[PDB]
Design a protein around this ligand. Structure first.
Ligand code: NA
Ligand SMILES: [Zn+2]
Length: 181
């Protein structure tokens, strides 16, 4: 597993609104299989994706699902730690919705560092994901540190939080839950 540079992680998962980073998304993913109330963690199916040549990371994740060789007779939970919530206007929310409709064996958990409200239809993207069965939430300190510990070439350095991490997370979470109520 190639691990992400720490600078790339910190530049992209920051949730401070005064840090500009609209040009790029990073999407860390893991997959587990749900059997009789216990998960089979599948470490060979973890990684991260960014946007490439105009194709958003969310669509690039959909692009690689067949290579994960999921058994449709099984149930899987996919988790996304994504630096921006998925857009509507460039097709991500719609494609994820259609994917989850066609792939009823897949459950999707989305934890976003920030809300992508550069998209005029960002609220509709979030509601569309919720309506398609995705559980959508804002990243807290716990998830940022997990991501640092799991996806980052950190050489045993501990996660060090940026100023305001918890405050911004809680404000974002309030906005999100208001949108999804
Ligand atoms: Na595709
Ligand atoms: Zn998108």
């Amino acid at each position: 597993r190639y691990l992400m540079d720490p600078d790339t992680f910190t530049s992209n998962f920051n949730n401070d609104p005064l840090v500009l980073r609209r040009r790029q998304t990073y999407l860390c993913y893991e997959v587990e299989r749900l059997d009789n109330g216990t998960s089979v963690k599948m470490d060979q199916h973890m990684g991260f994706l960014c946007n490439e040549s105009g194709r958003h990371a969310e669509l690039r994740f959909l692009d690689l699902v067949p290579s994960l060789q999921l058994d449709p007779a099984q149930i899987y939970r996919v988790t996304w730690f994504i630096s921006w919530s998925p857009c509507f206007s460039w097709g991500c929310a719609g494609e994820v919705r259609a994917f989850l409709q066609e792939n009823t064996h897949v459950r999707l958990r989305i934890k976003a560092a920030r809300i992508y409200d550069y998209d005029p239809l960002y609220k509709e993207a979030l509601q569309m994901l919720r309506d398609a069965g995705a559980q959508v939430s804002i990243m807290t300190y716990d998830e940022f540190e997990y991501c640092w510990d799991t996806f980052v070439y950190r050489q045993g350095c501990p996660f060090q939080p940026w100023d305001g991490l918890e405050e911004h997370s809680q404000a974002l979470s309030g906005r999100l839950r208001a949108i999804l109520q």
